[PDB]
């Protein structure tokens, strides 16, 4: 499984923006879970699985999340 | 915190559409977790902050009758 972790600044629609970006890149989730960040009081972390057909978008959505959104992101 | 548990039909952008509804109603999540369900669906466990309460009747309307999700639980 493709595993991706990212951290977002807390606000309404924070996750929705990420998922819109995923959808627009034909990325499809098989798992999501959140937890409050232990590092920053104003951040939430998200652990996701993506299906294998999402692989061609993977390098690129990582860069977009970091660049367009300012998320901290890591492929696991 | 408001507990809301619902299923969606599996498709690219399934969750994005729901989170757009939430966002447009000023609903803020504090937790999300998915699980595969019904073979072609996913179940979502969410918590909404108390400030989301004025939105509940509208998001339930749209979730049930527009998006066509099944709501398994709503509790506060
Ligand atoms: N595969 C769907 C539903 C889904 C979302 C998140 C986790 C698991 C399933 C999507 O990407 O929107
Ligand atoms: N509160 C933010 C981030 C978040 C999403 C989902 C779960 C937890 C936190 C939002 O509603 O988008």
Q: How many CA atoms lie within 13 A of A33 on its CB side?
A: 4
Whole-angstrom distance, CA of residue B55 vs CA of residue B47: 14
Half-sphere exposure of B30 (CA within 13 A, CB side): 11
Q: Is B54 helix (H, G, I), strand (E, B) or coil?
A: helix
Reported resolution in A? Answer: 1.8
Q: Is the CB of A25 under 6 A from ligand 1?
A: no
Give the separation between CA A74 and CA B18, rounded to whole angstroms.
25
Q: What are phi and psi of A56, to 5 degrees?
A: -65, -20
Rounded to a whole number of angstroms, the distance from the CA of A31 to the nearest CA of chain B is 6
CA-nearest residue to B18 within chain A is A16
B10 to chain A nearest CA, in Å?
A: 9
Q: Give the 3-state secondary structure of residue B2.
A: strand
Sign of CA dihedral B5, B38, A52, B21: negative
Rounded distance from Cα B38 to ligand 2 centre (Å):
26
Nearest-by-Cβ selection for B12 from A13, A16, A23 = A23
| Contact status, residue B15 vs residue B8, Cβ threshold 8 Å | yes
What residues pair up with A74 in beta bridges, in sequence order?
A: A5
Q: Quick check: helix, strand or coil at residue B40?
A: coil
Tokens of B59: 């998001």
Rounded Cα gap, residues B76 and B11, in angstroms: 30
- Which string of DSSP letters, residue by residue, matches B3-63? EEEEEEE--TTHHHHHHHHHHHTT--EEEEEEEE--TTEEEEEEEE-GGGGGGHHHHHHHI
Query: Are A21 and A4 in contact, with CB atoms under 8 Å apart?
Result: no
Q: Burial level of A47, CB count in 10 A (0-12/13-18/19+)?
A: middle
B32 Cα to the center of ligand 1, angstroms: 12
The CB density around residue B39, as the number of other CB atoms within 10 Å, is 6
Q: CA dihedral defined by A36, A38, A39, A40, rounded to 10 degrees?
A: 40
Q: Does domain B1-76 fall into CATH 3.30.70.260?
A: yes
User: Would you say the C-alpha torsion B44, A33, B59, A64 has a positive or negative sign?
Assistant: negative
């Amino acid at each position: 499984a493709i595993s991706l972790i990212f951290s977002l600044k807390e606000e309404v629609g924070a996750l929705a923006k990420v998922l819109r970006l995923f959808e627009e890149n034909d990325v499809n989730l098989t798992h999501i879970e959140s937890r409050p960040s232990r590092l920053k009081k104003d951040e939430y972390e998200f652990f996701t699985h993506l299906d294998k057909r999402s692989l061609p978008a993977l390098t690129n959505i990582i860069k977009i999340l970091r660049h367009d959104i300012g998320a901290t992101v890591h492929e696991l």
